Design a protein around this ligand. Structure first.
Ligand SMILES: CN(C)c1cccc2c(S(=O)(=O)NCCCC[C@H](N)C(=O)O)cccc12
Lengths: 113, 123
C-alpha cells in the first residue's frame, strides 16, 4: 500500500498565526489520467473527518479561502493564512490515486497553551 | 443535504460477531460506491471495505487485514450499507465510519459521525 506521511505530529499555534502541514507519499500520486488525487481532511475531537481540499488545491464546498493546498508528485503542503478556533483539530492527508486508499497519520493543530 | 448515520457499534468479545448499518439520504445512492473506514489511535484512519454500484455488479473490495472475516453489503432500495464483522479481533477496535465515492469523484466527501466498535475481553 502507498504509505502517507505527515509532519509534524503536533502543531501548536496561537490564533492568527500561520500554519503549514507536510504530507509525503511513498510513490507519485499522479494518476494515469493526469490528475493527482491527494486530499486533506480536518477532524475535530469526537467528530468525524470533514473534506477540506481535494485534488491538491481544490477547496471543498463551504471551505473558507484561508485554507490552501499545494505540492506535486510525492510532496504536498496544506497552509492556513491565519488560524481560527473552528480550524483546531487533527488534519489528515489521503491519496485515492492508488487502491487501497491510504491516510497519513495526522497532524494535531492545537492552541499554544 | 447529505446525511450518513452509522449504527450497530458496541463492545464485543474477541472472536465475536457484529453487524453495522448506515442509513443515507441526500445523494444518488445506486451509482455511488459505498465504503467503511475505521479509526483507532493504534493505526489512525484506515480503509476497510468498499462495495461498487450496479454498473460494477456490486463488486466488493476489502483491506487485507479484514478479508475473509468482514462482509460489506448494501440495500439499494433502502439506501443503506452494511458491514458484517465476524471472528472479530482486538485490533479491529475503533470508530467505524460510513462514507463513499463516485467513479469520477474518487474522494470521501461526506462521513457519518461514526459508531464505536470495541473488541476486548477485559477492561
Ligand atoms: C456520500 N458520497 C458518495 C457522496 C455524496 C455527495 C457528494 C459526493 C462527492 S462530490 O464531489 O461532492 N459530488 C460531485 C458529484 C455528485 C453528484 C451525485 N449524483 C449526487 O447526487 O450528489 C464526491 C464523493 C462522494 C460523494
Amino acid at each position: 500500500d502507498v504509505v502517507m506521511t505527515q509532519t509534524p505530529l503536533s502543531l501548536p499555534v496561537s490564533l492568527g498565526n500561520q500554519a503549514s502541514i507536510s504530507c509525503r507519499s511513498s510513490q507519485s500520486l499522479v494518476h494515469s489520467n493526469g490528475n493527482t488525487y491527494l486530499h486533506w481532511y480536518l477532524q475535530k475531537p469526537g467528530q468525524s473527518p470533514k473534506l477540506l481540499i481535494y485534488k491538491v488545491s481544490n477547496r471543498f464546498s463551504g471551505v473558507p479561502d484561508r485554507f490552501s493546498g499545494s505540492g506535486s508528485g510525492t510532496d504536498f503542503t496544506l497552509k492556513i493564512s491565519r488560524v481560527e478556533a473552528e480550524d483546531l483539530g487533527v488534519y489528515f492527508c489521503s491519496q485515492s490515486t492508488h487502491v487501497p486508499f491510504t491516510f497519513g497519520s495526522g497532524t494535531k493543530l492545537e492552541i499554544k497553551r | 443535504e447529505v446525511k450518513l448515520e452509522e449504527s450497530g457499534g458496541g463492545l464485543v468479545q474477541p472472536g465475536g460477531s457484529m453487524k453495522l448499518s448506515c442509513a443515507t439520504s441526500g445523494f444518488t445512492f445506486s451509482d455511488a460506491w459505498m465504503d467503511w473506514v475505521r479509526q483507532s489511535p493504534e493505526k489512525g484512519l484506515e480503509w476497510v471495505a468498499e462495495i461498487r454500484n450496479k454498473a460494477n455488479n456490486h463488486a466488493t473490495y476489502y483491506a487485507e487485514s479484514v478479508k475473509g472475516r468482514f462482509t460489506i453489503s448494501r440495500d439499494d432500495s433502502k439506501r443503506r450499507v452494511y458491514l458484517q464483522m465476524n471472528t472479530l479481533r482486538a485490533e479491529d477496535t475503533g470508530i467505524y465510519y460510513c462514507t463513499g465515492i463516485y467513479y469520477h469523484y474518487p474522494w470521501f466527501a461526506y462521513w457519518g459521525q461514526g459508531t464505536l466498535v470495541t473488541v476486548s475481553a477485559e477492561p
